[model samples]
Target: LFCKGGSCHFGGCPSHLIKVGSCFGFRSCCKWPWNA
Candidate 1:
């Protein structure tokens, strides 16, 4: 079990944990393209 902000973009987690919600902002910044 895991609790991520779950902002996976490029198949970070399992398909079950991947859901489209919000993109937040274009300047929020991220460690990876598939990161929260």
Candidate 2:
């Protein structure tokens, strides 16, 4: 699931939340389906 994307910190993902790179590249993690 690492390929999916999420908020990363400390050289790793902090939570199941969405990441900025994923949002910008995938454009789904932040736009809708997940965020909505």
Candidate 3:
């Protein structure tokens, strides 16, 4: 599930997270559920 949205980190994710690109192409991002 590396395409959802949750806790936007730096490099790589945890065990069950995502990486929806650099949020606004250079601001933020979600590692799971952006509304969760």
Looking at model 3, report the run of 10 residues with the lowest lDDT sum: 1-10
The lDDT of each candidate is: 0.36, 0.38, 0.44
TM-score of each: 0.18, 0.20, 0.24
Candidate 3 per-residue lDDT, tens place, 1-36, comes to: 233344444444553454454543442344655444
Residue runs of model 3 more than 4 Å from their true location after superposition: 1-4, 20-36
Q: Give the number of the best model, judged by TM-score.
A: 3
The candidate that wins on lDDT is 3
Candidate 3 is scored at a TM of 0.24
Clashing pairs for model 3 are: 5-32, 5-33, 6-30, 6-31, 6-32, 7-31
Candidate 2 lDDT (Cα, whole model)?
0.38
Candidate 2: regions farther than 4 A off: 1-12, 22-36
- Tens-digit lDDT string for candidate 2 (13-35): 43445443453333433222265
In angstroms, the error of model 1 at 16 is 1.0
After superposition, the stretches of candidate 1 with alpha carbons farther than 4 Å from their true spots are 1-5, 18-36
lDDT for model 1, please.
Answer: 0.36
User: What are the per-model C-alpha RMSD values against the true structure?
Assistant: 9.3, 8.4, 6.5
- lDDT (Cα) of model 3: 0.44
Candidate 2 structure, TM-score to reference: 0.20
* TM-score preference between candidates 1 and 3, better one: 3
Q: Is candidate 1 or candidate 2 better by lDDT?
A: 2
What is the full ranking by lDDT, best candidate first?
3, 2, 1
